[model samples]
Target: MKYLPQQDPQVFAAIEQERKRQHAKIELIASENFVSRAVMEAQGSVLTNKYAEGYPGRRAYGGCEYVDIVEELARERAKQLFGAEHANVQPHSGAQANMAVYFTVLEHGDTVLGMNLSHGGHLTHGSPVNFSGVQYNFVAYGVDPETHVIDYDDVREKARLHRPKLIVAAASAYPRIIDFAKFREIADEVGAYLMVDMAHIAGLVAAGLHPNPVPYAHFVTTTTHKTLRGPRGGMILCQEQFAKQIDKAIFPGIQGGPLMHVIAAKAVAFGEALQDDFKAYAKRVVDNAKRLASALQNEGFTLVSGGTDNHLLLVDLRPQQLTGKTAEKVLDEVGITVNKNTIPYDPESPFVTSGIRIGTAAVTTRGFGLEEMDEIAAIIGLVLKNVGSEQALEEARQRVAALTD
Candidate 1:
């Protein structure tokens, strides 16, 4: 496998440690994954040497013809994956794809409605601290305080009141499936354009597990990494009506040249995802997440929104008798990696949110099943349960070791 590091023990040791860490622990981070060896090699391939200053068929630089083919493959694969009329797989990150969409559709100070960042949404969805919020006039909505889930009635009310020009309907931490058809109806009532950021659920959507927003949303933005399980990059999908403006906005208005090598790897990943095995994988991802959430709740921890209908969910630790930050640190100390996150109407600050967010796709990639999720939930439960009790912590840590495989 060529893992023998060929030289310095320290460098070799670091690589070996990373390998062991990935193999030995369970990854719960919603946006992280272990790319295939083919993807790894493509990212490090000779194609990285190329500088394709424009898109496939038309570029400012010469000698881009072959690399152009690579980019074209990625664009076509993404379009086929999502059934979009046009797909631009060039942005460096999901945020850039969103920026391009916003720039293409709205002018500065235009009213855009997005989800609240502290309530299971991403920063770009109108958090004042983010550029999207500061550069444009934005209105933010959040989950229902009672249900701890998205409040569609409130969103519709706000849309009627503010009459925003663009409505963003996606999230980074939301565990439930969004109703795109309902959102589209609201957008039409407000005379607003709709953009969906499906970065977290793209793989599930591609595998026919979630509703496709491509038909309803005027624009869709996604990160190729996250649940897509591909190279780290961004993409934009749109209907034919907005094709030219979307492409131009991406090129000069948002990003410069595209990452040709990353695009090639993304194409390969999309191709893999089109196979039937990918459907089984995506279904397993959801099953594992549901089991994880159910097992945690069975252990007496309160999962925010009760449970998940998708690959990710959040556990509110208030009832478990720990803070989100403490659970995150304790999980890390025990070799289970997860991130602290906010719950709907969180009483704690952003840094010490009341809950922890987790996803199942990466663990599933490592070949974990529902049985493994039960064990993982137990490990996480005890780790949080015994955070202030050292003797109990050691006991729980050993149980984790027994389940490491």
Candidate 2:
């Protein structure tokens, strides 16, 4: 920071403003979290200067001895955290992690069954515009219209009908625990490999609050930043049989050199997750989400799936006759940040859907508890219910300031 302020005033100024902005706003984005200072330090270290083009002891370049240690530490820690036989801590993002898995397993034009995007699945999980759908003939399995939960029967039916080569289980906005065992059983029925993209709930799974997919699935992909509270990166876990194929797919297949600094930071975060306190923090994350869900229900807001069993909940804004687009903007105006999302079987467009996804991981990291959650729900009610009243907006802003301060 000292050198940057002196060397590049413009960049430094923008970064400084962003720091202030983060401190001043209530962050509710489900995929975001704050990393510890030790993580930040490792990410900003001298390791960024190295170029280790391969795994430990197998690098393509010279002078990779130290970075090899960092990568090994990250891989071992990830394996320990997730109870996996092999870990590849190299994919730059979650999309890449998923892409590597696909590359390792399926051929072009192979059939794959995944959750419907509008029903809580990620874009990389076969959205038409993405590479997965572009290459593979993708089929969709969705939640029940009334209960908003995955229909295992429908998944089995899809597998029987399409006979997909792979089946994906997990979601971005799903608030309940995924039954990975059921997914594995269905996959076995059709001779398909199972992959679980547990990106949003990785921290919960690591803490044993949610069911682990590693035991049931052949491949597991997750982002390090979400509930894991790590740097912005991705990791993949497998049963050691596919370890070499997965590693080759990541390196010479999709990407070039690994981000050594980010891998170092990932190791630090995984070390943190190994501690008992991370389990307590993860419990608070789920607890805070439950508290917020009930408070919102008390305010007459309906939650998708009735409630949450993890770190995030999707609030169905249709009952209030509000679009997720409108709600997101109004909340942002009052210094609260959230994203517009599509509810299951939503009548509106994806851009202006009937739901907003909220998570408590970041707020819980900031030490906000159940009382703060109630107040946040109340503030959301005030802003959304009185959007046109400037006086009420100001009051909500003041309350948001109080909570953030």
Candidate 3:
């Protein structure tokens, strides 16, 4: 910061503004988290200067001896945190982690079954615009219209009908615990490999609050940032048998040199997750989500699944006669940040959906507890219910300021 302020005043000024913005707003984005200072330090270290083009002891570069240790620590710590036989801590993002898994397992035009995007699946799962759908033939399985939960029966039927080469379990916006065992059983019946994209709930799984998918699925992909509270990167876990294929798929297959600095930071975050306090923090994250959901319900806002079992909940904004788009903007105006999302069986388009997704991971990290959650829900009710009243908006803003203060 010292050198940057003098060397690049423009960039430094923007970064400084962003820092203040983060402190001033209430962050509710499900996929975001504030990393620890140790993590930030490792990410900003001298390791970024190195180029270790391969795994430990098998580097393509001449002076990769030191970077080898950093990568090894990340790999080992990741394995210990997730209880996996092999860990590949290289993919630059969650999309790349998923791509690597597809590259390792399926051929072009192979059939794959995944959750419907509007029903909580990620874009990389099989969005036609993405590489996964562009290359492989993807069939979708959706949640029940009434309950808003994954229909395992429908998944088995899809597997039987399409006979997909792979079946993807888990989702980006699903608020309940996934039955990975059922996914594995269906996959086995159809002779398909199972992959669980546990990106949103990785921290819960690591803390054992949610069931681990490692024992049931052949491949597991997750982002390090979400619930893991790590730097922005992705990691893949698999049985030891596919370790070499997964490693090769990441390195020479999809990427060139790995981000050594990010990997170092990932190691630091994983080390933190291994401690008992992280378990307590993760519990608070889920507890806070449930509290927030109840408070919202008390405000007459309907939740997608009626409640949440993890860190995020989808608020169905229909009862309030509000569109997700309108609510997101109004909330942002009052210094609360949240993203518009599509509810299952939503009548509106993806861009103008009937739901907003909220998570407690970041707020819990900031030490906001159940009382703050009650206040936040009340503020949201105030803003959304009185969007046209400038006086009410100002009151909500001041209340938000008081909470952040």
Residue 31 C-alpha lDDT in model 2: 92
State residue 184's C-alpha deviation in candidate 2, in Å.
0.3
The lowest-lDDT stretch of 10 consecutive residues in candidate 3 is: 61-70
lDDT for 25 in candidate 2 is 96
What is the Å distance of residue 401 in model 1 from its true position? 2.8
State the C-alpha lDDT per candidate. Answer: 0.87, 0.95, 0.95
Arranged by lDDT with the best first, the candidates are 2, 3, 1
* Tens digit per residue, CA lDDT, model 3, 167-243: 99989899998999999999999999999999999999999999999999999999999999999999999999999
Stretches of model 3 off by over 4 angstroms after superposition? none
- Better candidate number, 1 or 3, judged by lDDT: 3
1-405 per-residue lDDT for model 1 (tens digits): 354566577788898889888877778999988888888878877887888876777898899889988888888888888899999888899999999999998988899988888877788887788889888888877788767788999789989989899999989899999989988999999999999999999999999999999999999999999878898989999999998899899887777877888888988888888888989999999999999999988888888788999999998888766778988888887778889998888899999998899999998998889888898888777777677788767877677677765
Across 281-305, the per-residue lDDT of candidate 2 in tens digits comes to 9999999999999999999899999
Worst 10 residues of 1 by lDDT: 1-10
Q: Which model is ahead, 1 or 2, in terms of TM-score?
A: 2
